[PDB]
């Protein structure tokens, strides 16, 4: 062991060796758009949310959402490669598919032709789909608020889509659709009594909760 390899530790206490490069992410002065994003999210959490708006916060759980997407991917619209291959064949010479678009889905629901409806949980503006849950519940159409308008658009070969509907399904996936309907109804349709009453928001910050708890303990003592 070389005697010259001597450890020389650094004291980072106040008035001592200069501070090292630590983590200061929470103190970064973020640009204006980032600040607005974060503050908007905080404000949405803090303010009390009326039930008809809060109903979109509680979406399908991970497992049920995975099952729904597994079923949905079986009827994706015609691809670009498929269209290219079909075009020249047709020049030389409509199965079941997922429907999309709020107007199309609304017409299907009002005509009671849709068997399952999936509504994106993050449609902005929210007034675009604010009526679909109530309309589906009124017409007795199974409906679920699912996470990801981008995910639905991917299912539909698009960027985003507000809502999708499964008008007709093959006998192979009839059982899958039935199970999906039961799972969707268990958590969305029958609980309409609680959904109409539940008020969201009102969550304070961790700092405020800590201060309130300290005050409560002090008063109890």
């Amino acid at each position: 062991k070389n005697p010259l390899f001597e450890k020389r530790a650094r004291n980072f206490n106040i008035g001592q060796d200069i501070q090292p490069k630590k983590d200061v992410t929470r103190f970064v002065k973020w640009p204006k758009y980032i600040r607005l994003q974060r503050q908007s999210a905080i404000l949405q959490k803090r303010l009390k949310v009326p039930p008809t708006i809060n109903q979109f916060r509680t979406a399908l759980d991970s497992q049920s959402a995975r099952q729904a997407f597994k079923l949905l991917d079986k009827y994706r619209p015609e691809s670009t490669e498929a269209k290219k291959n079909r075009l020249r064949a047709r020049a030389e010479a409509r199965p079941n598919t997922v429907r999309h678009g709020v107007n199309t889905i609304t017409r299907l629901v009002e005509t009671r032709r849709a068997q399952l409806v999936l509504i994106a949980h993050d449609v902005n503006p929210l007034e675009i789909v604010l009526h679909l849950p109530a309309l589906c519940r009124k017409y007795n159409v199974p409906y679920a608020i699912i996470k990801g308008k981008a995910s639905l658009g991917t299912v539909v070969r698009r960027k985003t889509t507000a809502a999708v509907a499964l008008v007709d399904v093959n006998p192979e996936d009839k059982s899958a659709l039935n199970k999906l309907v039961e799972t969707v109804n268990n958590n969305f349709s029958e609980r309409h009594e609680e959904i109409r009453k539940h008020w969201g928001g009102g969550v304070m910050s961790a700092k405020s909760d800590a201060k309130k708890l300290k005050i409560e303990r002090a008063r109890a003592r």
């Binding site: 490069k21 630590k22 983590d23 200061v24 992410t25 103190f27 970064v28 002065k29 973020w30 640009p31």
Partner: protein
Amino acid sequence: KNVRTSVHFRRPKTLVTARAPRYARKSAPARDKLDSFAVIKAPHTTESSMKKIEDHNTLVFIVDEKANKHHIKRAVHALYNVKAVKVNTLITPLQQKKAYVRLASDYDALDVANKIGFI
């Protein structure tokens, strides 16, 4: 979440691409109008200019107002095949550029003036 050791947020560096225009704005480049003929306008043939030519090996020219000493040197060389060791320039009260060109010792200003015509 991208650990940051600095409290300052700088704009991220992004790729910048050079222009690859789909057509030339100008069909053809403009031709340089300040050639030797434009640079050298006419010799100065006053008594003072003659004295300069005879006594100092210095030619006197009236030149374009947009020509600098480098332009005058190059134009004189290309027009009379004579080197210039120094070029002095002034602008007369009538806004005319007058240039005194001292030729190298090899050349004779009197002979060059004789050849040009002003003498």
